[PDB]
Amino acid sequence: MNPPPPETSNPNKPKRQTNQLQYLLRVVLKTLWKHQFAWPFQQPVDAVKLNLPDYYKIIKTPMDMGTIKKRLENNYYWNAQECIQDFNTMFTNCYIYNKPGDDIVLMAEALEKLFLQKINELPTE
Ligand SMILES: CCn1c(=O)cc(SCC(=O)N2CC[NH+](C3CCCCC3)CC2)c2ccccc21
Ligand code: NA
Ligand code: NA
Protein backbone atom coordinates (compact mmCIF):
# COMPACT_ATOMS: atom_id res chain seq x y z
CA MET A 1 0.00 0.00 0.00
CA ASN A 2 1.08 3.54 -0.75
CA PRO A 3 0.81 6.26 1.92
CA PRO A 4 -0.94 9.54 1.15
CA PRO A 5 1.42 11.69 -0.94
CA PRO A 6 3.15 14.70 0.62
CA GLU A 7 0.99 17.79 0.89
CA THR A 8 1.23 20.48 -1.79
CA SER A 9 -0.95 23.05 -0.02
CA ASN A 10 -1.27 24.10 3.61
CA PRO A 11 -3.36 27.23 4.28
CA ASN A 12 -1.95 27.80 7.78
CA LYS A 13 1.68 27.54 6.63
CA PRO A 14 3.25 30.96 5.93
CA LYS A 15 4.12 31.57 2.28
CA ARG A 16 5.88 34.14 0.14
CA GLN A 17 7.19 34.56 -3.40
CA THR A 18 10.91 35.32 -3.54
CA ASN A 19 13.13 35.77 -6.58
CA GLN A 20 15.06 32.63 -5.61
CA LEU A 21 11.91 30.50 -5.33
CA GLN A 22 10.75 31.73 -8.73
CA TYR A 23 14.19 30.78 -10.06
CA LEU A 24 13.94 27.31 -8.52
CA LEU A 25 10.73 26.75 -10.49
CA ARG A 26 11.45 28.51 -13.79
CA VAL A 27 15.13 27.53 -14.15
CA VAL A 28 16.19 24.78 -11.75
CA LEU A 29 13.19 22.45 -11.76
CA LYS A 30 12.27 22.95 -15.43
CA THR A 31 15.83 22.01 -16.41
CA LEU A 32 15.95 18.90 -14.23
CA TRP A 33 12.43 17.97 -15.37
CA LYS A 34 13.51 17.73 -19.03
CA HIS A 35 16.54 15.55 -18.24
CA GLN A 36 16.66 12.03 -19.66
CA PHE A 37 16.95 10.60 -16.13
CA ALA A 38 14.11 12.68 -14.65
CA TRP A 39 11.16 10.32 -15.16
CA PRO A 40 11.56 8.18 -11.98
CA PHE A 41 11.50 11.34 -9.84
CA GLN A 42 8.56 13.14 -11.49
CA GLN A 43 5.95 11.58 -9.16
CA PRO A 44 5.75 9.85 -5.76
CA VAL A 45 7.02 6.28 -5.59
CA ASP A 46 4.18 3.88 -6.37
CA ALA A 47 5.25 0.96 -4.18
CA VAL A 48 2.51 -1.26 -5.62
CA LYS A 49 3.11 -0.62 -9.33
CA LEU A 50 6.92 -0.71 -9.11
CA ASN A 51 6.78 -3.85 -6.89
CA LEU A 52 8.70 -2.14 -4.07
CA PRO A 53 6.71 -3.34 -1.05
CA ASP A 54 9.47 -2.36 1.40
CA TYR A 55 9.90 1.20 0.13
CA TYR A 56 7.73 3.03 2.64
CA LYS A 57 8.94 0.64 5.32
CA ILE A 58 12.39 2.18 4.77
CA ILE A 59 11.63 5.71 3.52
CA LYS A 60 9.66 7.67 6.11
CA THR A 61 9.97 11.14 4.51
CA PRO A 62 9.21 10.59 0.81
CA MET A 63 9.72 13.39 -1.69
CA ASP A 64 9.70 13.74 -5.46
CA MET A 65 10.03 16.45 -8.10
CA GLY A 66 6.32 16.26 -8.91
CA THR A 67 5.53 17.24 -5.32
CA ILE A 68 8.21 19.95 -5.39
CA LYS A 69 6.84 21.28 -8.69
CA LYS A 70 3.31 21.59 -7.29
CA ARG A 71 4.65 23.17 -4.09
CA LEU A 72 6.49 25.80 -6.14
CA GLU A 73 3.46 26.42 -8.37
CA ASN A 74 1.09 26.71 -5.39
CA ASN A 75 3.48 29.06 -3.52
CA TYR A 76 3.94 26.59 -0.67
CA TYR A 77 7.42 27.60 0.49
CA TRP A 78 8.66 30.38 2.76
CA ASN A 79 12.15 30.52 1.23
CA ALA A 80 14.42 28.77 -1.25
CA GLN A 81 16.13 26.71 1.45
CA GLU A 82 12.86 24.90 2.22
CA CYS A 83 12.64 23.92 -1.46
CA ILE A 84 16.32 22.95 -1.66
CA GLN A 85 15.78 20.76 1.40
CA ASP A 86 12.99 18.91 -0.43
CA PHE A 87 15.38 18.24 -3.32
CA ASN A 88 18.01 16.93 -0.91
CA THR A 89 15.44 14.67 0.76
CA MET A 90 14.50 13.24 -2.64
CA PHE A 91 18.13 12.46 -3.48
CA THR A 92 18.96 11.10 -0.02
CA ASN A 93 15.92 8.80 -0.09
CA CYS A 94 17.19 7.30 -3.34
CA TYR A 95 20.67 6.64 -1.93
CA ILE A 96 19.20 5.17 1.26
CA TYR A 97 16.80 2.74 -0.41
CA ASN A 98 19.14 1.68 -3.24
CA LYS A 99 22.80 0.76 -3.51
CA PRO A 100 25.80 2.35 -5.27
CA GLY A 101 25.93 1.34 -8.92
CA ASP A 102 22.19 0.76 -9.36
CA ASP A 103 20.67 2.35 -12.45
CA ILE A 104 18.35 4.48 -10.30
CA VAL A 105 21.31 5.74 -8.25
CA LEU A 106 23.26 6.68 -11.38
CA MET A 107 20.21 8.68 -12.49
CA ALA A 108 19.93 10.38 -9.08
CA GLU A 109 23.65 11.21 -9.10
CA ALA A 110 23.39 12.81 -12.55
CA LEU A 111 20.41 14.90 -11.44
CA GLU A 112 22.04 15.85 -8.13
CA LYS A 113 25.22 17.09 -9.80
CA LEU A 114 23.09 19.08 -12.26
CA PHE A 115 21.01 20.37 -9.35
CA LEU A 116 24.14 21.61 -7.58
CA GLN A 117 25.36 23.37 -10.74
CA LYS A 118 22.06 25.25 -11.08
CA ILE A 119 21.75 26.35 -7.43
CA ASN A 120 25.44 27.29 -7.08
CA GLU A 121 24.32 30.81 -8.02
CA LEU A 122 20.81 32.06 -7.24
CA PRO A 123 19.35 35.51 -7.92
CA THR A 124 19.50 38.11 -5.17
CA GLU A 125 16.39 39.37 -3.40
C1 LIG B 1 13.60 7.18 -6.97
C2 LIG B 1 12.53 6.17 -6.55
N3 LIG B 1 12.84 4.83 -7.07
C4 LIG B 1 13.66 4.03 -6.37
O5 LIG B 1 14.14 4.44 -5.31
C6 LIG B 1 13.98 2.75 -6.82
C7 LIG B 1 13.42 2.31 -8.02
S8 LIG B 1 13.74 0.73 -8.67
C9 LIG B 1 14.41 -0.20 -7.25
C10 LIG B 1 14.50 -1.67 -7.70
O11 LIG B 1 14.40 -1.94 -8.89
N12 LIG B 1 14.63 -2.60 -6.74
C13 LIG B 1 14.73 -2.25 -5.31
C14 LIG B 1 14.02 -3.27 -4.42
N15 LIG B 1 14.36 -4.66 -4.78
C16 LIG B 1 13.64 -5.59 -3.89
C17 LIG B 1 12.13 -5.38 -3.97
C18 LIG B 1 11.43 -6.42 -3.10
C19 LIG B 1 11.89 -6.29 -1.66
C20 LIG B 1 13.40 -6.49 -1.59
C21 LIG B 1 14.10 -5.45 -2.45
C22 LIG B 1 13.94 -4.91 -6.17
C23 LIG B 1 14.70 -4.03 -7.15
C24 LIG B 1 12.57 3.16 -8.72
C25 LIG B 1 12.01 2.74 -9.92
C26 LIG B 1 11.17 3.59 -10.63
C27 LIG B 1 10.88 4.85 -10.13
C28 LIG B 1 11.44 5.27 -8.93
C29 LIG B 1 12.29 4.42 -8.23
NA1 NA C 1 21.44 2.42 0.49
NA1 NA D 1 22.10 29.30 -11.17
Torsion, Cα 73 77 80 84, to 10 degrees, reads -90
Ligand nearest to the CA of 105: 1
Q: What one-letter code names the amino acid at 1?
A: M
Phi/psi-derived region of residue 51, left when phi > 0, alpha when psi is between -120 and 50, beta in every other case = left
66 lines ligand 1 (CB under 6 A): no
Burial degree of 87 (CB within 10 A; 0-12, 13-18, 19+): buried
Contact, 64 vs 45, CB < 8 A? Answer: yes
Calpha distance 114→120 (Å, rounded): 10
Domains of the chain, CATH where assigned: 18-122 (1.20.920.10)
Phi/psi-derived region of residue 75, left when phi > 0, alpha when psi is between -120 and 50, beta in every other case = left
Three-state secondary structure string covering 35-79 = CCCCHHHCCCCCCCCCCCCCHHHHCCCCCCHHHHHHHHHCCCCCC
Q: How was this model experimentally determined?
A: X-ray
Calpha distance 98→45 (Å, rounded): 13
Q: What one-letter code names the amino acid at 93?
A: N
Calpha distance 33→11 (Å, rounded): 27
Surrounding ion ligand 3 within 5 Å at CB are 118, 121
Calpha distance 119→15 (Å, rounded): 21
Contact, 21 vs 77, CB < 8 A? Answer: yes
